[PDB]
């Protein structure tokens, strides 16, 4: 089928205009079957943003928000759902757990039915709970049971700091040497992303000694989407447990954790899933392990609900990942996630991934075209990336990042020179991408 | 000074009425300097409660809510504070972390200044984070480092199930025999509460082999307030680490964790602290351990904020308990807790504990007076209990609990026969206690 760059020049051919003309972006939004979803979100105005130099912007104009990858915008329905739960708490205080049309006791275990299609798993293979890093530890404390023969953990170079710290401390818990035990796949010299063959070679050479493989679904600094089902097959052949940190993947790319055979997974709620800052995170355990892999750390919401409130202390554990649930779920954070997940159910994940490829692609085309003083670190193949592109510039005398945010472009800056732009399909339009690059152009021309 | 029962009969002497007359309760509320705080909370109406038999109640009348111990009522200011944070998230999406009058990055580390006086600790000795049981595990994984000589954990009989399960799994993590390693102090035959001497004797006989002592601050089934500073001194003399699960204690009784020398502590937010269901919990580590006891499981919000966002993976850990913070704090749950903690700052914890003693005492007086077919399991000494009283009845032919909740009395039922009533000083008035016992009287007379 049609590659994204091919799609743009074809539109220009239909309109008899240049590929970089505004009319191309305005036409891609006219034909965007998801364009009405942007209304469901609160989009910042430029003059409200702190770093904005008001001299350089037209006030009363929407901001280009390309941090759907870091803290996702608020659905307008969030406050509406909060009000439902706040009134119930103000109407029947403790009875909201077991009484009424929607018991609190079943929230985390019902809105999982909205997560099934986002990660590709079953009802009983997912729990929405705790926070990302803690779910990473609660999973590792079960799957990472090392032996003298099999003791390593395989992660990637320059991984996300919380993951990296979580793995040292997992190894430091069992007394393992860090240098010997942390196998960190580094990219080849002069290269920014990882090679799938280099990863598989290490798994084949060393996998007999690796206990757990733990990558991110999308690497934060490069935006690289790792071939998840491949790493799983390779790792599982050598006898490894394979799990991923799907923070930048979930809500961004299509995921089939169950069919792919992934052993475990974990993700957060406040990035592409547009829940609240620090919102409720999630876990995953393939049902193959529902009766073999047990929770290392146990709470009382790991007990079967049927006899949980007898409190007779005679543990009857819930199989699967709901056994790692220690505590009562934070109902008001589940509430917010429900509002966002209903939106993901309307605009199918497939329909978002399809726009995400054309939208990020239209960003890549407009960057490569005009420019080289810009290096797109993100993999160019449409399948090895997500919403996010990572950029580095060779303009020495201007800070591109500061110059961009002065003008209402909200995007990340990652050390050393990396800046991250992530147009997401829910609230970002092609005209946002057009408006972006002409500011990036006006800046790089000085 | 005046014991609570002495106070009631003196009021009756001033009014020349019977101690059990309504005029006594109505007078204790007139003179209640905290009576206006009840307005700050949403109090259920009887006809809105599910179990209510409408034939047996006067509709349009406030409900007697004595579950401040299980799920605390909603401050009316909660929705107001949520709106502040929801507008900021809708106004400056990602900039709320570092920009403006109140950065999100400092929420959990600022409203700790409202927790200092509730547990009796310093700024740096408390973090508000995660959930109760998980904070219990994250603490145990550091303080419970056992040896062949020193391997036991001391808890109480019929402890709260989440605690009990959390301790088995802590021992099962290190391979320890459960029967040998779990030292469970059981009450004497025919007795419901524990004896402080029986606890100290075990600590003296066996303490050389105990690695960690972990009781609740108030036992859920009996309501017994354990002499916390005594257990600490005794346990620390024999070389034990001593920590408590302060769930029913915090927000209920006065606590001096720092001066008492308590090694660690953990509590929840949704009981007496009146945060949301499943709301943010808290942790405690005395500053003596700020540089000796390190986190077992590490996240990236365990890193110093000054260089946390360089993400260079060169860990620089925060001393004290803020090092056990793994993840980004859930801002909207901190928000709610801020609303409740401001109320605790207005009505001083001392002023609440003072009413709590007279209010629970006026409940005990009216129960003992008329009745014996009722057994108050809760310790009778005003210092060995909190808000909660636990009851058992010898009426065979009526279920007291069902008969009570039919009439708008919201209180707990704990297996086997225990029911828990907990008038709290914020929203509960003496007239609630008067109205309660006359229903309990009308019921027990059949």
From Swiss-Prot, chains A, B:
Compartments annotated for it: namely: Cytoplasm, Cytosol
What single Pfam family name could you report for this chain, choosing any that match? Answer: KYNU_C
Q: Which Gene3D superfamilies match?
A: Aspartate Aminotransferase, domain 1, Type I PLP-dependent aspartate aminotransferase-like (Major domain)
Entry EC number(s):
3.7.1.3
Induction line: Increased levels in several cerebral and systemic inflammatory conditions.
| Top-level division of the source organism's lineage | Eukaryota
State where pyridoxal 5'-phosphate binds.
132-133, 160-163, 216, 245, 248, 270, 300, 328
> Per UniProt, what does mutating residue 193 to A do?
In HYXKY; reduced 3-hydroxykynureninase activity
SUPFAM superfamilies linked: PLP-dependent transferases
One GO cellular component this record assigns the protein to is: cytosol
Tell me how activity varies with pH: Optimum pH is 8.25 with DL-3-hydroxykynurenine as substrate.
Indicate where this protein is primarily found: cytoplasm
Which top EC class is named for this enzyme in its record?
Answer: hydrolase
Give the UniProt record's GO annotations in the biological process aspect. Answer: 'de novo' NAD biosynthetic process from L-tryptophan; anthranilate metabolic process; L-kynurenine catabolic process; L-tryptophan catabolic process; L-tryptophan catabolic process to kynurenine; NAD biosynthetic process; quinolinate biosynthetic process; response to type II interferon
Q: Name one GO molecular function term.
A: kynureninase activity
Pathway in which the depicted protein is active? Amino-acid degradation; L-kynurenine degradation; L-alanine and anthranilate from L-kynurenine: step 1/1; Cofactor biosynthesis; NAD(+) biosynthesis; quinolinate from L-kynurenine: step 2/3
| PANTHER family per the UniProt record, alphabetical | KYNURENINASE
Disease entry from the Swiss-Prot or TrEMBL record: Hydroxykynureninuria: An inborn error of amino acid metabolism characterized by massive urinary excretion of large amounts of kynurenine, 3-hydroxykynurenine and xanthurenic acid. Affected individuals manifest renal tubular dysfunction, metabolic acidosis, psychomotor retardation, non-progressive encephalopathy, and muscular hypertonia.
Give the record's subunit note: Homodimer.
The protein depicted here goes by the name Kynureninase
Q: To which species is this protein native?
A: Homo sapiens
Lineage, opening ranks: Eukaryota, Metazoa, Chordata, Craniata, Vertebrata
């Amino acid at each position: 089928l049609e590659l994204p760059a091919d799609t743009v020049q074809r539109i220009a051919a239909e309109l008899k205009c240049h590929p970089t003309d505004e009319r191309v972006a305005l036409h891609l939004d006219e034909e965007d079957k998801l364009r009405h979803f942007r209304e469901c979100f609160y989009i910042p105005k430029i003059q409200d943003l702190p770093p904005v130099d008001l001299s350089l912007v037209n006030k009363d104009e929407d901001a280009i928000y390309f941090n759907g990858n870091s803290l996702g915008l608020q659905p307008k329905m969030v406050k509406t759902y909060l009000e439902e739960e706040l009134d119930k708490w103000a109407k029947i205080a403790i009875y909201g757990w077991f009484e009424g049309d929607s018991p609190w006791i079943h929230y985390d275990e019902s809105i999982v039915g909205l997560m099934k299609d986002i990660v590709g798993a079953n009802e009983k293979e997912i729990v929405l709970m705790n926070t990302l890093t803690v779910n990473l530890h609660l999973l590792m404390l079960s799957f990472f049971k090392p032996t003298p023969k099999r003791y390593k953990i395989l992660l990637e170079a320059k991984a996300f700091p919380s993951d990296h710290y979580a793995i040292e401390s997992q190894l430091q818990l069992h007394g393992l040497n860090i240098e010997e035990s942390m196998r960190i796949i580094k990219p080849r010299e002069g290269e920014e992303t990882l090679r799938i063959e280099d990863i598989l070679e290490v798994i084949e050479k060393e996998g007999d000694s690796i206990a757990v493989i733990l990558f991110s679904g999308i690497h934060y600094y490069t935006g690289q989407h790792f071939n998840i089902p491949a790493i799983t097959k390779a790792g599982q052949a050598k006898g490894c447990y394979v799990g991923f940190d799907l923070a930048h993947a979930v809500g961004n790319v299509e995921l089939y954790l169950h069919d792919w055979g992934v052993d475990f997974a974990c993700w957060c709620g406040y990035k592409y899933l547009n829940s609240s800052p620090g919102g409720i995170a999630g876990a995953f355990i393939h049902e193959k392990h529902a009766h073999t892999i047990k929770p290392a750390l146990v709470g009382w919401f790991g007990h079967e609900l049927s006899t949980r409130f007898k409190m007779d202390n005679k543990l009857q554990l819930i199989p699967g990942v709901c056994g790692f649930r220690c505590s009562t779920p934070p109902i008001l954070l589940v509430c917010i996630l429900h509002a966002s997940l209903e939106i993901f159910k309307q605009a199918t994940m497939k329909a978002l991934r399809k726009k995400s490829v054309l939208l990020t692609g239209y960003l890549e085309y407009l960057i490569k075209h005009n420019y080289p003083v810009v290096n797109i670190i993100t993999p160019s193949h449409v399948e090895e990336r997500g919403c996010q592109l990572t950029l580095t510039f060779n303009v020495p005398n201007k800070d591109v990042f500061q110059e961009l945010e002065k003008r209402g472009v909200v995007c990340d800056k990652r050390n050393p020179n990396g800046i991250r732009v992530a147009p997401v399909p829910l609230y970002n339009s092609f005209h946002d991408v057009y408006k972006f690059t002409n500011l990036l152009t006006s800046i790089l021309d000085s």
